[PDB]
A paper describes a structure:
The HIV-1 envelope glycoproteins (Env) undergo conformational changes upon interaction of the gp120 exterior glycoprotein with the CD4 receptor. CD4 engages gp120 by introducing its phenylalanine 43 (Phe43) in a cavity (“the Phe43 cavity”) located at the interface between the inner and outer gp120 domains. Small CD4-mimetic compounds (CD4mc) can bind within the Phe43 cavity and trigger conformational changes similar to those induced by CD4. CD4-induced (CD4i) conformational changes in the gp120 inner domain involve three flexible topological layers (layers 1, 2, and 3).
To better understand the molecular basis of this phenomenon, we solved crystal structures of gp12093TH057 corees containing the LM mutations in combination with H375S (LM+HS) or H375T (LM+HT) in their unliganded state. Unliganded structures of the LM+HS and LM+HT cores were solved at 2.2-Å and 2.5-Å resolution, respectively. There is close similarity between the structures of the LM+HS and LM+HT corees. Indeed, alignments showed that they have a root mean square deviation (RMSD) of 0.43 Å for their main chain atoms. Alignments to the wild-type gp12093TH057 coree, resulted in RMSD values of 0.45 Å and 0.54 Å for the LM+HS and LM+HT mutants, respectively, indicating a larger dissimilarity between the LM+HT and wild-type coree structures. Interestingly, a closer look into interactions formed by mutated residues in the LM+HS and LM+HT corees (magnified view) reveals a new network of interactions mediated by Asp474 and Arg476 that stabilize the inner domain mobile layer 2 and 3 interface in the CD4-bound conformation. Asp474 in combination with Glu102 in layer 2 formed a network of hydrogen bonds with Arg476 in both LM mutants that bridged the two layers. The levels of main chain atom B-factors corresponding to the residues in this region are much lower for the LM+HS and LM+HT mutants than for wild-type Env, implying that there is a greater degree of structural stability in this region in the LM mutants. Interestingly, another region of the CD4BS was found to be significantly rigidified in the presence of the LM+HS/T mutations: the V5 loop region (residues 457 to 468). With respect to the issue of why T375 seems especially able to induce susceptibility to CD4mc irrespective of the LM, one clue from the structures presented here offers a possible explanation: space in the Phe43 cavity near S375 is strongly occupied by a density that may represent water or a crystallization solute, and this density is largely lacking for T375; these observations suggest higher susceptibility for T375 because it has fewer solvent molecules to eject in permitting CD4mc binding.
Residue numbers in the entry: 42 to 124, 198 to 300, 325 to 355, 357 to 396, 409 to 492
Amino acid sequence: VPVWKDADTTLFCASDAKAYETEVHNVWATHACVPTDPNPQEIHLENVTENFNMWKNNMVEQMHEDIISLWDQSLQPCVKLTGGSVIKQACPKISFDPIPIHYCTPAGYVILKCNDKNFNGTGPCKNVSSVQCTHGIKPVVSTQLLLNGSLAEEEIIIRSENLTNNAKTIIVHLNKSVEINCTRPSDIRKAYCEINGTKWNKVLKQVTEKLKEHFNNKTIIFQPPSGGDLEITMHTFNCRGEFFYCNTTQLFNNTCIGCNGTITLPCKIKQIINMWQGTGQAMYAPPIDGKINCVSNITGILLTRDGGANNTSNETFRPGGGDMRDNWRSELYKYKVVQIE
Ligand SMILES: *[C@@H]1O[C@H](CO)[C@@H](O)[C@H](O)[C@H]1NC(C)=O
Ligand SMILES: *[C@@H]1O[C@H](CO)[C@@H](O)[C@H](O)[C@H]1NC(C)=O
Ligand SMILES: *[C@@H]1O[C@H](CO)[C@@H](O)[C@H](O)[C@H]1NC(C)=O
Ligand SMILES: *[C@@H]1O[C@H](CO)[C@@H](O)[C@H](O)[C@H]1NC(C)=O
Ligand SMILES: *[C@@H]1O[C@H](CO)[C@@H](O)[C@H](O)[C@H]1NC(C)=O
Ligand SMILES: *[C@@H]1O[C@H](CO)[C@@H](O)[C@H](O)[C@H]1NC(C)=O
Ligand SMILES: *[C@@H]1O[C@H](CO)[C@@H](O)[C@H](O)[C@H]1NC(C)=O
Ligand SMILES: *[C@@H]1O[C@H](CO)[C@@H](O)[C@H](O)[C@H]1NC(C)=O
Ligand SMILES: *[C@@H]1O[C@H](CO)[C@@H](O)[C@H](O)[C@H]1NC(C)=O
Ligand SMILES: *[C@@H]1O[C@H](CO)[C@@H](O)[C@H](O)[C@H]1NC(C)=O
């Protein structure tokens, strides 16, 4: 029966948000999202091939606008420094822990979902189903590393809009998540992250063999970022309200590609940050007393490749990205909205 035309349209959101919670993601979804589909139904689309493009699907920008909305309402800095002004207010300690959000089509439209195990984000898909809503997607803001997302079903996948353009971000979708366990124990700003060295280097070596496949068997080097602001040169993430900055030099080490134990990353909790929203500079209050612990799964990696190296034997890759959209993209690549014609 069904037939369609690809189109863009305004989505709505659904969640399990508990309405008794003071947590901020739950509050936001409690008043800006409906409940989740109590009877979710996925329909296989028989013998259809559908072209997808994760680098040009308007669901990314909608999710982005939502996360901006949530952070503007939820976070309370003591002082905001935007475009030549300075707004001051009260900065209490909030409750912070992202919850999965579902995205759903209005009537006359439907979501398509690519189920090709190794599909790279662009191109034809031969196992296409139709859903009302995406799956639940945690809105985890981070640089350098993708946290608390979804793994690739089969092999590690390299995602890029154009691998030959070195200004285009590369996303690595891992097959196997590696824990990063970060703790500020009871200088109150100093904390550390622990990663399994064995698993990390096994995964990293696999990552460069895949990168070797895509880059004509060339030698693949990892280097740290070549300067910039701390949110660029550090793996940054929010744990329990505190903004964490971690040094990833030990992770992107090439000789391990006597190193087999726990890798310990030095980190600092910052009160003064440069808002990822682009608006400007923000100041929050000193950290919570006692132990501050967050355990997360690395499930993907963000990478930028140097240019001016074509007449070399090497290709060198630094952690990076910057644009938060790619985060959302890393979970929305297998979806696209269509208009039922
Ligand atoms: C298509 O995807 C489904 C769901 O992921 C899975 O059972 C299998 O990989 C494929 N099934 C068929 C019948 O092609
Ligand atoms: C993704 O697959 C298409 C073929 O459908 C191919 O042209 C493109 O190069 C692939 N992208 C990457 C990054 O391998
Ligand atoms: C971490 O990854 C495992 C699968 O490798 C999964 O079972 C677990 O729920 C993940 N934890 C979080 C918080 O996503
Ligand atoms: C991970 O993917 C690599 C190739 O990309 C493969 O060698 C390995 O078997 C995969 N591991 C799992 C657990 O799927
Ligand atoms: C990919 O990027 C390269 C380098 O920027 C560019 O010259 C080329 O035209 C692009 N190719 C495609 C198919 O977009
Ligand atoms: C995380 O690290 C802390 C201190 O380094 C340790 O006490 C705790 O057992 C770790 N938790 C997990 C789940 O690895
Ligand atoms: C790393 O993982 C291995 C299995 O690959 C496990 O035996 C060990 O507990 C882990 N070691 C550390 C230091 O996390
Ligand atoms: C690249 O290397 C792989 C294994 O390392 C090998 O099977 C393949 O022949 C090489 N490809 C080219 C084009 O040389
Ligand atoms: C990370 O640590 C190394 C030494 O371990 C240091 O040289 C480097 O400057 C640090 N990174 C940043 C961004 O400060
Ligand atoms: C990842 O998920 C775990 C369990 O839900 C949570 O404790 C941790 O804070 C999350 N990490 C981030 C960066 O949100």
